[PDB]
């Protein structure tokens, strides 16, 4: 951000601040399971209020409601409650993020007002697909722009997304916040001359998105574990494995052999799982089973964790690493029946940190592993960015950063 306006140089006195944050927090039973991302924005928010901002209007997405209002499922209102306690100031929650009533609420607020808007992705114009029309995208952006006099982007977690709230706000001063700065600085340092072998661990559930990041990552790392939900696309293509109802990406399947070829060309050792804990449905209380790559996963069952032989291979890769970036649990760690693989890998990553490995864990869900097993201070860095971090690993400038004002 050397070339970009940042909040430390933004005059906020008497100014309404509209601030993009990543408040896409994990949820279970309608309760927030990790407030890490909310906590992480508090320094920028407090700084605005402390230096005389008239208001701070906070805006974020939650989940992927795909451009339709889903207040029953993906409302930010529970975040408003949680932010109140973390800030030490109350926060007014609005039931939309645009236009007439929202604009009036944000137009001329009482001094020191903190305002949290509803989920930006309840509008198709944020992403804007989920057919979004250009004229409406423009109007959405124009509405968001009215809500502050100056703009701050502290949404590191979302910085890889060229969405309306992230790149489309039209105000004279668009400043990076302190979390954006903290995260970018940490990665700049850690990615400059990584310790080697440099292992990437890619798991989780955002297969369509994250399979597309592997190609450029293969020029940067010396090993890659491909686990969690990601593995099944590779296994079906490479091994002709039956995967049942496990996560599968049709588009990504088409580049699996090219990715493996590139890994071979680049001397990147690829560790895929060889065994699984299976489930008869996507449920905490599913009946469970065991499968190997040889046995395949039965029709109508899904692999929701790796098994012990996979964990041993993962451990082997960790033991070789001098640096690790991990994004994506290697099973559905939120459910105890499917948490063992991720716990075992976490145990190994902590053991690695203790003998000098530089260990970076990132993501809304993956950081929640750290919170669950109390390892946030037992690894080198826990990032609020998952996909955002992997895009820095590829060597990319993030759109949310690129959109900021130059100095
Ligand atoms: N085999 C699997 N099948 C389905 N979901 C999985 C599997 N392994 C991991 N997951 C899920 O991946 C989710 C997180 O993935 P993702 O959103 O990509 O990570 P993050 O928030 O760290 O970037 C977790 O909620 C976990 O339940
Ligand atoms: F689900 Be994200 F990549 F933190
Ligand atoms: Cl995805
Ligand atoms: Mg996630």
Curated annotation (Swiss-Prot):
Region (Mitochondrial targeting region exposed following cis-trans isomerization by PIN1 and recognized by the TOM complex for mitochondrial translocation of the protein) residue ranges read 36-41
Places the protein is found: Cytoplasm, Cytosol; Mitochondrion matrix
Q: Which is a Pfam family this sequence falls into?
A: PGK
Q: Which GO terms describe its molecular function?
A: ADP binding; ATP binding; metal ion binding; phosphoglycerate kinase activity; protein serine kinase activity; protein serine/threonine kinase activity; protein-disulfide reductase [NAD(P)H] activity; transmembrane transporter binding
Class of this enzyme: transferase
- Which residues bind ADP per the record? 204, 228, 333
- Name positions with the PTM N6-succinyllysine: 4, 46, 181
Positions bound to ATP = 205, 210, 229, 303, 334, 365-366
Q: Cite any additional comment in the entry.
A: Dysregulated mitochondrial targeting of PGK1 may contribute to the elevation of aerobic glycolysis seen in tumor cells, a phenomenon known as the Warburg effect.
The disorder on record is: Phosphoglycerate kinase 1 deficiency: A condition with a highly variable clinical phenotype that includes hemolytic anemia, rhabdomyolysis, myopathy and neurologic involvement. Patients can express one or more of these manifestations, and some affected individuals develop parkinsonian symptoms.
Q: What is this protein called?
A: Phosphoglycerate kinase 1
Q: Please give the organism.
A: Homo sapiens
């Amino acid at each position: 951000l050397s070339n970009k306006l940042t909040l430390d140089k933004l005059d906020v006195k008497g100014k309404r601040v509209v601030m993009r944050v990543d408040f896409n927090v994990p949820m279970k039973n309608n309760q927030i399971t990790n407030n890490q991302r909310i906590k992480a924005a508090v320094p920028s928010i407090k700084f605005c209020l402390d230096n005389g901002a008239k208001s701070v209007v906070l805006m974020s997405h939650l989940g992927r409601p795909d451009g339709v209002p889903m207040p029953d499922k993906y409302s930010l209102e529970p975040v408003a409650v949680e932010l109140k306690s973390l800030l030490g100031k109350d926060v007014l929650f609005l039931k939309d993020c645009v236009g007439p009533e929202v604009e009036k609420a944000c137009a001329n607020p009482a001094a020191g007002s903190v305002i949290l808007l509803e989920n930006l992705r309840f509008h198709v114009e944020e992403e804007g697909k989920a057919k979004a029309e250009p004229a409406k995208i423009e109007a959405f952006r124009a509405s968001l722009s009215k809500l502050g006099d100056v703009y701050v982007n502290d949404a590191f977690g979302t910085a890889h997304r060229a969405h309306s709230s992230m790149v489309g706000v039209n105000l004279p001063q668009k400043a990076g916040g302190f979390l954006m700065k903290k995260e970018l600085n940490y990665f700049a340092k850690a990615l400059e001359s990584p310790e080697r072998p440099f292992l990437a661990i890619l798991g989780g559930a955002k297969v369509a998105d994250k399979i597309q990041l592997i190609n450029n990552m293969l020029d940067k790392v010396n090993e890659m574990i491909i686990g969690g939900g990601m593995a099944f696309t590779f296994l079906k293509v490479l091994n002709n494995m039956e995967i049942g109802t496990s996560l599968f990406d049709e588009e990504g399947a088409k580049i699996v052999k090219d990715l493996m070829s590139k890994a071979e060309k680049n001397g990147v050792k690829i560790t895929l799982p060889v065994d699984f804990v299976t489930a008869d449905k996507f449920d905490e209380n599913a009946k469970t089973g065991q499968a190997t790559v040889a046995s395949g996963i039965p029709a109508g069952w899904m692999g929701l964790d790796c098994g012990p032989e996979s964990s041993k291979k993962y451990a082997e890769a960790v033991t070789r690493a001098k640096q690790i970036v991990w994004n994506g649990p290697v099973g559905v760690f939120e459910w105890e029946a499917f948490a063992r693989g991720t716990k075992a890998l976490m145990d190994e990553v902590v053991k690695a940190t203790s003998r000098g490995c530089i260990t970076i864990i990132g993501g809304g869900d993956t950081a929640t592993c750290c919170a669950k097993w109390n390892t946030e201070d037992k690894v080198s860095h826990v990032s609020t960015g998952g996909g955002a971090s992997l895009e820095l690993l590829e060597g990319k400038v993030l759109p949310g950063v690129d959109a900021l004002s130059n100095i």
